[PDB]
Symmetry: C3
Subunit: 117 residues, 3 copies
């Protein structure tokens, strides 16, 4: 797939997702929510969406990833919504690994109003 | 697929998930967990499960979605488990978009006790 | 698939994921993050990764699961990263259900630097 930017890294065939980098330094006080920029854009392949999910190293620090659904038609820059849900302050350095992008399949169904048994 | 209720919206072919609506007004104080009702029921297609995941607009407000696995055999009403992990109070209006439902494939394996190399 | 340990349970064909058990008692104060051990190891099938996601019963208690991506090539013991994002203390008993493991498909793409339209 075509991407733009160096905020996303190539993975091995045995890894589920691509590491995403922080485009700039970010400081987060306990309970603070910030949308961290990555500087990358992508043209997800037709029939798939992208899931942003956390990495064990940052997660074990009390940081969580909110939202996380990259739609196939999105062309904007990818942003990672992060909250410090721990009780201590944390600083993420520029170009630090903050999350992962996993490509998964799309299933489009038509909504039929009926009565579920 | 067959659904029941107007708490879930039809999506475009380029979107990954269906927007879920809050069935009633909800107030959440910092650190509060509440199971928000949607009023919708569904008959997921055989071979798939449903994943409830957050929307960027509410996530950027410090709200997170817990749990989130809708099993293929579930017929009850879908509920969205939400926590305010931010430091300020928040009110979700009736019929406000609070989450997304994405349909993904099922992989059933048999558990073989052995020794992993 | 081959596993090692009794910290993971067999599921029915209509359930999305396998219940994961806590290998030991864990106490978590509000805002505390701990990596709970399960004692299980697995040889995920080629072409799939594993997703650790929350269960409604523990999620409705204000506990969340961070990280959660089990790579196909991982052979270590599976650990569940848990945070108490609620305002009250919680104790998880030994061998208590704390999460779920769902097997999903792998999509490996090659990164092509270009210009996304
Ligand atoms: O964590 C996230 C979630 C979403 N988006 C982007 C791509 C999505 O297609 C778009 C649309 O918004 P939501 O439907 O996800 O709120 O926002 C991000 O950059 N980061
Ligand atoms: O966020 C959630 C998670 C679960 N369920 C429902 C459908 C599931 O099949 C059922 C079973 O419970 P758990 O195994 O997810 O705890 O609860 C919801 O409505 N909302
Ligand atoms: O919640 C988690 C997340 C990861 N791992 C394991 C298996 C992964 O392959 C490995 C690698 O680390 P990350 O790339 O997920 O940080 O850690 C766990 O046991 N539990
Ligand atoms: Mg979370
Ligand atoms: Mg999550």
């Amino acid at each position: 797939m075509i991407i733009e930017g160096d905020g996303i890294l190539d993975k091995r065939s045995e890894d589920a997702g691509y590491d995403l980098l922080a485009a700039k330094e970010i400081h987060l006080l306990p309970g603070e929510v910030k949308v961290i920029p990555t500087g990358v854009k992508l043209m997800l392949p037709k029939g798939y969406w992208g899931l942003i999910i956390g990495k064990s190293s940052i997660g074990s620090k009390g940081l969580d990833v909110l939202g996380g659904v990259i739609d196939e038609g999105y062309r904007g820059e990818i942003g990672v919504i992060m909250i410090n849900v721990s009780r201590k302050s944390i600083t993420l350095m520029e170009r630090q690994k903050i999350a992962q992008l996993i490509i998964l399949p799309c299933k489009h169904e038509v909504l039929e109003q009926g009565k579920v048994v």
